[PDB]
């Protein structure tokens, strides 16, 4: 019977739940890093559940879901991905209870996304909206969220760079979701984090020109989705391999064709030519390109066809497999096309001004070294995420697991008010909240069962007059030390586990 699935489910339950605890050890920065041996047989030390999910993992199906548990929250808010694992085992406990209570996993499921809709309101009831139209508010808030987080040093510097690059991809007063889509994060090997800079036309890998103009203004950006190499009738060459004599006349053929298509390039014309890799091509004849930049066209060669897809959408240089697809049509018009070799190492074609869809925003990442480059990458991304957290979900809420302490007691009664056989469900549903700050209270160190009992009254009283406050890690107003989070990291965490549980509940 579905008992065997329940067993399976229980076994999946058995797998997934102990896994969620391993991150509960890493819950919060007060939560502890976890040393991990890998196939290398070497230690791996992270407080990051998302990697601990990915890095060494069991492919058990319940465990398979839990990476996407965070990986959604990874891609949802970019943040709060520990919590979404820390929310998992809390119901997974309670769900087995109902299963142990004999509650039908549908009814179990059925009771939840139902009651989840409830909780988020009361959760949102706790919340304080900030101004998404105001750059500085968010520049204060996500910063305060960055201040609520570990990465500051560059994030401080990079909050304006984030929020501005965001504010530049903020058209709306709502500030929409602020897709990181329109953002191109580029790194340049030289420079410093001070030399990380927001650029309003795409900073492009390198540049490639033989006789091609070094920097062309008003650049018509070509793209080559067509093969510049003459057709391959033997190896790469329009010749066939037998003797010296017959091939040289069709060596003449390889000549003109590669030039003509190249001639045709500049004849419909471009100031710049996007060129993907020649492996991203069948083949591209350089003697054509030798003549193509000899036609004095600024060009880049060997760029990601996927970054091309980014380039196509952001600066409006559309995919071109044809001379005809060159007019100005699929060609983005780039006001200043130049590569900057400057500030130490690296060279990157930097579009300065363009004819571009949306507001095209690329940020250079320069750093004292590669590692210094590497470190600011989260700094923005962190900021960029808590931004795309809060701009996407307007209402801001404080962190520290308090809203869970706040929401549980209420949903327990809401369960009771809801009543019904599903009350016990929604009760157990409500009963998964404190678990996160519970382990978190240990993660800062405390007795949550002692501490959370009291905030729960505090959160019975002011609903937040206090909360586990990361430095304190204990009862005090978290709005006072400003440990803050957009509702997105919270809300985005809710549906996943529940649904994924709601999934595994129906799942045999």
């Amino acid at each position: 019977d579905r008992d065997k699935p329940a067993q399976i489910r229980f076994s999946n339950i058995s797998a997934a739940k102990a896994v969620a605890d391993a991150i509960r050890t890493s819950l919060g920065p007060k939560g502890m890093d976890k040393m991990i041996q890998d196939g290398k047989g070497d230690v791996t030390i992270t407080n990051d559940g998302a990697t601990i999910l990915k890095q060494m993992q069991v492919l058990h199906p319940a465990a398979r879901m839990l990476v996407e548990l965070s990986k959604a929250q990874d891609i949802e808010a970019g943040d709060g991905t520990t919590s979404v694992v820390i929310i998992a085992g809390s119901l997974l406990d309670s769900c087995t209870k109902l299963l142990q209570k004999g509650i039908h996993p549908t009814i179990i499921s059925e009771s939840f996304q139902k009651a989840l809709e409830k909780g988020i309101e009361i959760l949102t009831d706790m919340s304080r909206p900030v101004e998404l139209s105001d750059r500085e508010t968010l520049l204060n808030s996500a910063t305060t969220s960055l201040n609520s987080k570990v990465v500051s040093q560059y994030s401080s510097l990079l909050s304006p760079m984030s929020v501005n690059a965001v504010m530049k991809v903020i058209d709306p007063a709502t500030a929409t979701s602020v897709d990181l889509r329109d953002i191109k994060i580029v790194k340049k090997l030289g420079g410093t984090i001070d030399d990380c800079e927001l650029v309003e036309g795409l900073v492009l890998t390198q540049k490639v020109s033989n006789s091609g103009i070094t920097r062309v203004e008003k650049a018509k950006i070509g793209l080559i989705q067509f093969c510049l190499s003459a057709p391959k009738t033997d190896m790469d060459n329009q010749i066939v391999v037998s003797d010296y004599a017959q091939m040289d006349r069709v060596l003449r053929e390889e000549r003109a064709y590669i030039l003509n298509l190249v001639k045709q390039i500049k004849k419909t014309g471009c100031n710049v030519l996007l060129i993907q890799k020649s492996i991203l091509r069948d083949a591209l004849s350089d003697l054509a390109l030798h003549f193509l930049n000899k036609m004095k066209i600024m060009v880049i060669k060997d760029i990601e066809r996927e970054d091309i897809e980014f380039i196509c959408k952001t600066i409006g240089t559309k995919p071109v497999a044809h001379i005809d697809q060159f007019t100005a049509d699929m060609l983005g018009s780039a006001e200043l096309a130049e590569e900057v070799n400057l500030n130490g190492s690296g060279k990157l074609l930097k579009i300065t001004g363009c004819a571009s869809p949306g507001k095209t925003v690329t940020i250079v990442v320069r750093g004292s070294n590669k590692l210094v480059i590497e470190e600011a990458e989260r700094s923005i991304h962190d900021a960029l995420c808590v931004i795309r957290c809060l701009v996407k979900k307007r209402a801001l809420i404080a962190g520290g697991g308090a809203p869970e302490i706040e929401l549980a007691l209420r949903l327990t009664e809401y369960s009771r008010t809801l009543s019904g056989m599903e009350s016990y469900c929604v009760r157990a549903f409500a009963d998964a909240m404190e678990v996160i700050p519970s382990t978190l209270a240990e993660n800062a160190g405390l007795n949550p069962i002692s501490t959370v009992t009291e905030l729960r009254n505090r959160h019975a009283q002011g609903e937040k007059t206090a909360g586990i406050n990361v430095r304190k890690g204990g009862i005090s107003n978290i709005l006072e030390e400003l440990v803050v989070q957009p509702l997105l990291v919270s809300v985005s965490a809710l549906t996943l586990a529940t649904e994924t549980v709601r999934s595994i509940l129906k799942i045999d």
């Binding site: 008010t417 019904g420 056989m421 009992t453 009291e454 009254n457």
Partner: protein, 517 residues
């Protein structure tokens, strides 16, 4: 031995209650199922009564001994209330262990239940705190003995039993004394009777009857001879019986026993008592001499029962024949050997009306169970009725109150920053298993069942209606008339929670094994 502590004995605690409670919760209430339980003696005992199940079991652990004894208090106190006080007491262990598994220290969780046991008995108080007298209560008493008599699944027409329990308890346990008194109730009955045949005989009915039908079958009012005097073999504490071995030894044995009993039956009749009830009653030889002197009189009586005819009849005591005087005699309103329609149940009533110091319920039934059926039926009725006769305080039961009690505390839990809210929650959370287990014995969804009432208790904000305790389809504690003494409703709580507490303060166990009864 071994000191067994931590989860070790905490299991040995939580272990025993579960095996105990479940046969009780499957036997819980009328929907509770009737359990055949056979001894090592090979004897079938069908037990739907947890207390009888408790009387049938002794489960090995010290608490399982005490749980058998736990209900006996409220079984003596309240009658009904035997099964629920135990079955939930183990549920606290379920609650508590998980709570200790939550990391909450055992004495922490130990205390919060009692701490929350206030509202438990306190929320009950608000339902009916009422008080009525005998002729008033008799309607609530039969209405409660709709449930209490029917708790043994015998209430039908047995408002006879209820109404005789109405006037039985007030007699013995006065409404003003508010002290438990069943002592002057004289429990009496015989196999072979009927459920529908049951009597309250305000006087004392003695098994023995008139020594002859030729002698009158009526002794007049009063004039009963209360005596310890031999009319048959005396049977003292210790003497050995030697008989006669000879022909010349046989003859005189008949003459002497004739010569003394005549004078004794004379002197008794000469004393002026027309029923001689002798602590040492009559042989068959004393009967004919009793017929010679022509006096109505009684054969062998139990030793203390001649006192029971001294106390209950108001007759001033003569201990023995040697002291015979007309002043101190046994009393009777009317002396009749009474057959109730089943001659299998046949008693000589020594009838008390004016001064009755022992009221006698006479119960009947076709079998040993059927009397006992009616016995434990009415006796548990008797006690709730006693509780109600002193103060008539009821509630709408079967979990309808358990939910309503579960509201306040579990609510009041979070009102408190204190750790015991979890206990208070689990306290109010442990309450609702009764309608749950009832609905299971009632053969319904137990889980919605509780919440059906809380959906009500949302609407209601009071037990009145409830789920089905009788499986009859009307969801009521009200018009279904699940109505029981609010006293005993509070007796289960204080007994359950505070016993478990005393069980909980002890994880410290020195036994050769884990659970030792």
């Amino acid at each position: 031995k071994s000191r067994l502590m931590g989860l070790e004995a905490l299991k040995s605690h939580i272990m025993a209650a579960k095996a105990v409670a479940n046969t009780m919760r499957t036997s819980l209430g009328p929907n509770g199922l009737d359990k055949m339980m056979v001894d090592k003696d090979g004897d079938v005992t069908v037990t739907n009564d947890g207390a009888t199940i408790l009387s049938m079991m002794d489960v090995d652990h010290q608490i399982a001994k005490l749980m058998v004894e736990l209900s006996k208090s409220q079984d003596d106190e309240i009658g009904d209330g035997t099964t629920g006080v135990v079955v939930l007491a183990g549920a606290l262990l379920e609650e508590a262990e998980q709570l200790l598994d939550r990391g909450i220290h055992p004495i922490r969780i130990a205390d919060g239940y009692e701490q929350a046991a206030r509202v438990a008995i306190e929320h009950l108080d608000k339902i009916s705190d009422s008080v009525l007298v005998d002729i008033k209560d008799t309607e609530p008493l039969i209405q409660t003995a709709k449930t209490t008599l029917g708790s043994k699944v015998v209430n039908s027409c047995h408002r006879q039993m209820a109404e005789i329990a109405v006037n039985a308890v007030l007699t013995v346990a006065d409404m003003e004394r508010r002290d438990v008194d069943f002592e002057l109730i004289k429990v009496e009955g015989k196999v072979g009777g009927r459920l529908e045949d049951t009597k309250l005989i305000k006087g004392v009915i003695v098994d023995k009857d008139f020594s002859h039908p030729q002698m009158p079958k009526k002794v007049e009012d009063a004039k009963i001879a209360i005596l310890t005097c031999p009319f048959e073999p005396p049977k003292p504490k210790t003497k050995h019986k030697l008989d006669v071995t000879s022909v010349e030894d046989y003859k005189a044995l008949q003459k002497y026993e004739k010569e003394k009993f005549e004078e004794m039956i004379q002197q008794i009749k000469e004393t002026g008592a027309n029923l001689a009830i002798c602590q040492w009653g009559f042989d068959d030889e004393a009967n004919h001499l009793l017929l010679q002197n022509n006096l109505p009189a009684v054969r062998w009586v139990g030793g203390p029962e001649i006192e029971l005819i001294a106390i209950a009849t108001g007759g001033r005591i003569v201990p023995r024949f040697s002291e015979l005087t007309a002043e101190k005699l046994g009393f009777a309103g009317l002396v009749q050997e009474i057959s109730f329609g089943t001659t299998k149940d046949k008693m000589l009533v020594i009838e008390q009306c004016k001064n009755s110091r022992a009221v006698t319920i006479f119960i009947r039934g076709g079998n040993k169970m059927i009397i006992e059926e009616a016995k434990r039926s009415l006796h548990d009725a008797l006690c709730v009725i006693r509780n109600l006769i002193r103060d008539n305080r009821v509630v709408y039961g079967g979990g309808a109150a358990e939910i309503s009690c579960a509201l306040a505390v579990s609510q009041e839990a979070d009102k408190c920053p204190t750790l015991e809210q979890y206990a208070m929650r689990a306290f109010a959370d442990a309450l609702e298993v009764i309608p749950m287990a009832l609905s299971e014995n009632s053969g319904m969804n137990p889980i919605q069942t509780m919440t059906e009432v809380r959906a009500r208790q949302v609407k209601e904000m009071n037990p009145a209606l409830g789920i089905d305790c009788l499986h009859k389809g009307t969801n009521d504690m009200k018009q279904q008339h699940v109505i029981e003494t609010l006293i005993g409703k509070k007796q289960q709580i204080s007994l359950a929670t505070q016993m478990v507490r005393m069980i909980l303060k002890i994880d410290d166990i020195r036994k050769p094994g884990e659970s030792e009864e």
